Amino acid sequence: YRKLGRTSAQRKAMLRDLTTDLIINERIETTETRAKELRSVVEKMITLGKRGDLHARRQAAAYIRNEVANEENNQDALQKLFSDIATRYEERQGGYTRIMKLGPRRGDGAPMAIIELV
Amino acid sequence: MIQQETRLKVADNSGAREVLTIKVLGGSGRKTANIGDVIVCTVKQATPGGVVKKGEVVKAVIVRTKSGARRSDGSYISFDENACVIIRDDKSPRGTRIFGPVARELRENNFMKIVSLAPEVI
Amino acid sequence: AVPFRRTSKMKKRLRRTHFKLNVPGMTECPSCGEMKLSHRVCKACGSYNGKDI
Amino acid sequence: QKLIEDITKEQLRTDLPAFRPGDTLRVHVKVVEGNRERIQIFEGVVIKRRGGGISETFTVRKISYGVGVERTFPVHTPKIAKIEVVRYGKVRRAKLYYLRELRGKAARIKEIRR
Amino acid sequence: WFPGHMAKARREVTEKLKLIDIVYELVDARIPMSSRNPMIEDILKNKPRIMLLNKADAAVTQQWKEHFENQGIRSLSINSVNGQGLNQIVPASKEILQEKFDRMPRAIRALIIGIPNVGKSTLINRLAKKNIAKTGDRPGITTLELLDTPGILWPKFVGLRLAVTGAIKDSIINLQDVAVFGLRFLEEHYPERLKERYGLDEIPEDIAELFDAIGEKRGCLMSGGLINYDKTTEVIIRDIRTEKFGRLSFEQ
Amino acid sequence: TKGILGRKIGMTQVFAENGDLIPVTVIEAAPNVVLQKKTAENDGYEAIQLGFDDKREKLSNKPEKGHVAKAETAPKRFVKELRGVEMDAYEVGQEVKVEIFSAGEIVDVTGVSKGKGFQGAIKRHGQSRGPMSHGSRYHRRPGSMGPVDPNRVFKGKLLPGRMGGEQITVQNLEIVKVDAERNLLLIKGNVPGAKKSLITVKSAVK
RNA sequence: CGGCUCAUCGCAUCCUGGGGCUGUAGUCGGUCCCAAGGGUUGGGCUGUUCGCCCAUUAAAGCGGUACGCGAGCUGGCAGAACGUCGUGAGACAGUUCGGUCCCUAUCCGUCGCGGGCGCAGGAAAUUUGAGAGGAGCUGUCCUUAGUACGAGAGGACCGGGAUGGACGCACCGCUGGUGUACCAGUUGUUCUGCCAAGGGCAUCGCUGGGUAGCUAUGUGCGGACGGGAUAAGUGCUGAAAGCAUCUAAGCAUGAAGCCCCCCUCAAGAUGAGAUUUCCCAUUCCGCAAGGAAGUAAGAUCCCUGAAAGAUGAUCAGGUUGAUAGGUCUGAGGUGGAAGUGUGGCGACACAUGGAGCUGACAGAUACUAAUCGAUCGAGGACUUAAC
Numbered sequence A: 001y002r003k004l005g006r007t008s009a010q011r012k013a014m015l016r017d018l019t020t021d022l023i024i025n026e027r028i029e030t031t032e033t034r035a036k037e038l039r040s041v042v043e044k045m046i047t048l049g050k051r052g053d054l055h056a057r058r059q060a061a062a063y064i065r066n067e068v069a070n071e072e073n074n075q076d077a078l079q080k081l082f083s084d085i086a087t088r089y090e091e092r093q094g095g096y097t098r099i100m101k102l103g104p105r106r107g108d109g110a111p112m113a114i115i116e117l118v
Numbered sequence B: 001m002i003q004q005e006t007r008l009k010v011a012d013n014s015g016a017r018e019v020l021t022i023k024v025l026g027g028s029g030r031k032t033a034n035i036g037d038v039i040v041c042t043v044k045q046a047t048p049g050g051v052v053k054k055g056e057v058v059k060a061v062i063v064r065t066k067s068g069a070r071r072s073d074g075s076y077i078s079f080d081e082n083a084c085v086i087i088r089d090d091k092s093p094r095g096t097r098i099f100g101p102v103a104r105e106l107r108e109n110n111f112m113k114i115v116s117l118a119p120e121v122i
Numbered sequence C: 001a002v003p004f005r006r007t008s009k010m011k012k013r014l015r016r017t018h019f020k021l022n023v024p025g026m027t028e029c030p031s032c033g034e035m036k037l038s039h040r041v042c043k044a045c046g047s048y049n050g051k052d053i
Numbered sequence D: 001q002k003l004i005e006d007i008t009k010e011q012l013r014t015d016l017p018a019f020r021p022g023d024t025l026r027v028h029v030k031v032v033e034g035n036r037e038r039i040q041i042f043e044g045v046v047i048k049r050r051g052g053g054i055s056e057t058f059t060v061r062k063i064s065y066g067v068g069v070e071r072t073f074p075v076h077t078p079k080i081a082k083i084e085v086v087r088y089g090k091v092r093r094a095k096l097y098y099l100r101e102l103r104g105k106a107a108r109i110k111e112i113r114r
Numbered sequence E: 001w002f003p004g005h006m007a008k009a010r011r012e013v014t015e016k017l018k019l020i021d022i023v024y025e026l027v028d029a030r031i032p033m034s035s036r037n038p039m040i041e042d043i044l045k046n047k048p049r050i051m052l053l054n055k056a057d058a059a060v061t062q063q064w065k066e067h068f069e070n071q072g073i074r075s076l077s078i079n080s081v082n083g084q085g086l087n088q089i090v091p092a093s094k095e096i097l098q099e100k101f102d103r104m105p106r107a108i109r110a111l112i113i114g115i116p117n118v119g120k121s122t123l124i125n126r127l128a129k130k131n132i133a134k135t136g137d138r139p140g141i142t143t144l145e146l147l148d149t150p151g152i153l154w155p156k157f158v159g160l161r162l163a164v165t166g167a168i169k170d171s172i173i174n175l176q177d178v179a180v181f182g183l184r185f186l187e188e189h190y191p192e193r194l195k196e197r198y199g200l201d202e203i204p205e206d207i208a209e210l211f212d213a214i215g216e217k218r219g220c221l222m223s224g225g226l227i228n229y230d231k232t233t234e235v236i237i238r239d240i241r242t243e244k245f246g247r248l249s250f251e252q
Numbered sequence F: 001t002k003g004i005l006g007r008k009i010g011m012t013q014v015f016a017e018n019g020d021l022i023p024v025t026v027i028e029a030a031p032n033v034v035l036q037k038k039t040a041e042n043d044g045y046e047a048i049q050l051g052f053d054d055k056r057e058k059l060s061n062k063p064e065k066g067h068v069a070k071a072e073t074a075p076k077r078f079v080k081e082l083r084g085v086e087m088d089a090y091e092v093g094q095e096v097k098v099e100i101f102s103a104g105e106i107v108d109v110t111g112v113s114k115g116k117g118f119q120g121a122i123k124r125h126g127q128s129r130g131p132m133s134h135g136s137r138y139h140r141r142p143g144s145m146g147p148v149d150p151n152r153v154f155k156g157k158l159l160p161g162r163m164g165g166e167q168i169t170v171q172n173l174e175i176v177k178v179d180a181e182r183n184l185l186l187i188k189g190n191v192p193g194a195k196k197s198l199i200t201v202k203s204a205v206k
Numbered sequence G: 001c002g003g004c005u006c007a008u009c010g011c012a013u014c015c016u017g018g019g020g021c022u023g024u025a026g027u028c029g030g031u032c033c034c035a036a037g038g039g040u041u042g043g044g045c046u047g048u049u050c051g052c053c054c055a056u057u058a059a060a061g062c063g064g065u066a067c068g069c070g071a072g073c074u075g076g077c078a079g080a081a082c083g084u085c086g087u088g089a090g091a092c093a094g095u096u097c098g099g100u101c102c103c104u105a106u107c108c109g110u111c112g113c114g115g116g117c118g119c120a121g122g123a124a125a126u127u128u129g130a131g132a133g134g135a136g137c138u139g140u141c142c143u144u145a146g147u148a149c150g151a152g153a154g155g156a157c158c159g160g161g162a163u164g165g166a167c168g169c170a171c172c173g174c175u176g177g178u179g180u181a182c183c184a185g186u187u188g189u190u191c192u193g194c195c196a197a198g199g200g201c202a203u204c205g206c207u208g209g210g211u212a213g214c215u216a217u218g219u220g221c222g223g224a225c226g227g228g229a230u231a232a233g234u235g236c237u238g239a240a241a242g243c244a245u246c247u248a249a250g251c252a253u254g255a256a257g258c259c260c261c262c263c264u265c266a267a268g269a270u271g272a273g274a275u276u277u278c279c280c281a282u283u284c285c286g287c288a289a290g291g292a293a294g295u296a297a298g299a300u301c302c303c304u305g306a307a308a309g310a311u312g313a314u315c316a317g318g319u320u321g322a323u324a325g326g327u328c329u330g331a332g333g334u335g336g337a338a339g340u341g342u343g344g345c346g347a348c349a350c351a352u353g354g355a356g357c358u359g360a361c362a363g364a365u366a367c368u369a370a371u372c373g374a375u376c377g378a379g380g381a382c383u384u385a386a387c
């Protein structure tokens, strides 16, 4: 696994907020290396969504930050998983995302990509 | 894993208490002695009325290692309190009788007089 | 340490040889385009293997 | 290691009993000093239960005349004759390392029989 | 048991054993006979020399002096604090050495050596009226007309009676030696003296048990009621060198 | 002087009719198939081209495609020879397995070492440390190159370089057990090579 | 200055090998040649070389290279105390403490790793081995054997057989260490509305463990068998020299030296090796000499990875696919989840249940990601022989 350029306490918080930002907007522009590591933790989030246990909720609750997720429903990031994300991915086993890569930006040299839910 | 300048304890009734190593007899240059090696020794604390006295320099045999005495046969032995027997010249100790157990690693060499006085051999 | 000499007008021109960077990979787009870096979605059309994204 | 585990069961011994990591069992060790086998029965408490298939292992601590004796008897070895349990003891964990220190009256709290 | 600090120094210094007229030897007043030096006994021949037994603070001293005097050597006891016995050593440098005083106004240069920590560094400042240097440890310095404050000690190293005056190094050479032996002199010669310093009623036989009887009165414990041996080694040598037990002898 | 060569898998223990908890290696290779006979009068000396772990046509190549039709075997990988084998029982197309080795026979291994990456002077050349305290910052550095009057460096003085990726011979090893059905050789001791890498198992050169 | 790293080097040898002569009955010895291949210590106490002590060992070899090595390390002049000298200012190969010597490597050397180009066509593999490097130590013990020996005691030689140390090479299955996204226990506050259960931070909060990988103190293994030529010699044959001779002719013999045998790198060994197998002998411009332009065989760009790795490269792989991740089924690890129920005044216990959880470890599985494409890359010159 990639150290992602930050320290460990930063590293665990580096990605949890991405997962909130993932399942809300469904489609993120991101630095591809951070994107390349992220797909192997949020599929563990989605498959943990596909249990439906209350015990399945709390393990996500230790991970997913309680952002207000979808407007005018007050659907939480937790409450968007098991009511909408699980039923959107009932049949497909594995491979819930992909990394279509993009070019580099102007003032970094950093290669880019796009993470969606598919 | 005894070394030079290692604190050892008495296991026989020699009256001695604390033993500081000087040099490992086994081989030449090496300072690591596991079990049964001959270890020349000095004495930091002793009971007075006995065979030897305080600060005497004698020879001795390791009995107890905290490090792993390991057989070829897969078995393992490690003691807690690193003790040592106070021998004189040959493989016969200068002690009267042994405080506590000695491992069964003295079979390889001819130390089969201290094994006779053992309360336990494991 | 110190550069003891000026380096030459030769060897400086003889140092930059393996410095000049390679051509990046260029592939012809499969829909409306002219050039696009291999394996990655072009920014012109925004399509990849028959998929608008 | 799927192409290894097949050879292992053929040499494996099943005649063991299963046991918790923190307990007291007795073991019989076949010893070959000369020509006579001094089959001895070593009993006491156990600490380690580090696995290994072929190399499943455990440790036996036994106080002896004022000092404990760590025993690293191999689970998969014919020199073991028989393992016989004594105390199904309540132990919080699978690593009783700290009773290399509290050697005295701390063997009771860790040996709540069950 | 000592480096090129006393033996090596004396070796090169021994080269000035012809310009020296009177030699001043030094032995301990507590123990006379072991406090000689058999290396300097071989370099110092055919010279009048006077023996001195300093820190005299008497019955055993005088007795030994009588035998020593008849031995061929003159013994004069001096002091380090008071001015007593210095009125017989000053006039002896021009009387005993009358062979080199009126034979030719030549100087009287003296060589002062012997055993360390027994009264060698304090032999210059009271023969003069000014301090020069001083150490309370085993070592000293490395320096009438006098340039003499070195040390003889022992080139190669009976020692049980030696270190009770602390004439050698004791950082770590041996500390249990003075413990196991020195109380026997308090047992064998003056058994009544121990009954008051720590308040013991009767001296027991186990010399290790008398440590714990002393040490629990002391309080230099180590862990959980256990009295430390090595600290109780210190409180015995701390008292015998300050003469807390009084005036005691060694050899008879 | 015989030899198979095959991949390794892991490390195990096997005790056989004694307490001997012997560390054993996981050397499992398929029946080697003589590729091409080197004869002395044609190619300077005698040898046996051997193959192992044959792949499929995805990694095949018209050079290596005709390399095997003389032997009539699928295109495999790791094609090595054996300078020491007999030139009698090793014809073109012959198949050799583990049925050659049995119990109590000295073996030899030459295998590719682990690549530890670009280490320092310490773990490559066995260089010890300097003093870590007492004012000296100096440690973990290979010391002076040597004298002054040469005004140069002796080629052979140690220095931190990349260590690994070269072969290692280990002689005087023994076999504890053979199993022909899983095609497994078991070697007492330890054998150089990371997992899934080829191991020449040649007869222990007495 | 002395050490620390590290070395290499001489022989005038410290031990181990090979013989000589003595005061070597046998064991054990001093002393003189051969010999530089390895190997040659750890403490107190010393500024520390000087010296002293202890324990060692097969023995702690002398010496050189800016008294080997400070752009690699290691302070290890002003103020004072002093004594002494000079009236004093101030002196001193006089004594004690306090006391800051800088560097990003350009070049050459080194240790690696690449890229170009060569090797009269490309490729793909396999190798040859001139030449270079590494390896070269021994101690105890057991037989033979108390045999050979000697008034005795003593007690081998030659030669087998165990077992160590040092040192080198490999490796994680044992044995332990490590593990910063694993596991639970717990403090302090804050945080999701509260309770419960959780998150954040506090050296990774702290303490108890630990997969993987990397590791030594752990484990395996090495220094064998030997041949060939030589030293000192040991000799045989005999000349010079009617005897005779180690020597001149001519033979042997004989050392851990030295070649070679083990190992490793080695055809950029410009002498560019050699087999095996591919691959075609195009289209074209120029009278021709030739020059291009497409392409094979094939490699690569590019992409997912690690057995690899500072990057390059190497290696596994690129949709007739298991390279990676996910998914499962597992392993190993910690080990008794939550919820609920019971019991307890409660703190908590017990039940459902070796539970729940898990980072690189397995094994299946096209579910995602390796698309779609592009580029490079040969038509084999010239003598002469044999065919």
Ligand SMILES: Nc1nc2c(ncn2[C@@H]2O[C@H](COP(=O)(O)OP(=O)(O)NP(=O)(O)O)[C@@H](O)[C@H]2O)c(=O)[nH]1
Binding pocket: E053, E054, E055, E056, E078, E079, E080, E081, E115, E116, E117, E118, E119, E120, E121, E122, E123, E134, E135, E136, E137, E138, E139, E140, E141, E142, E149, E150, E151, E152
């Ligand atoms: N009471 C008493 N004390 C004395 C006597 N002599 C010396 N001392 C004290 O014991 C200490 C040691 O004396 P010293 O002369 O420095 O010993 P040293 O033998 O000269 N040492 P070094 O040979 O190394 O210079 C001094 O400090 C002094 O005060 C004495 O005769 N009587």
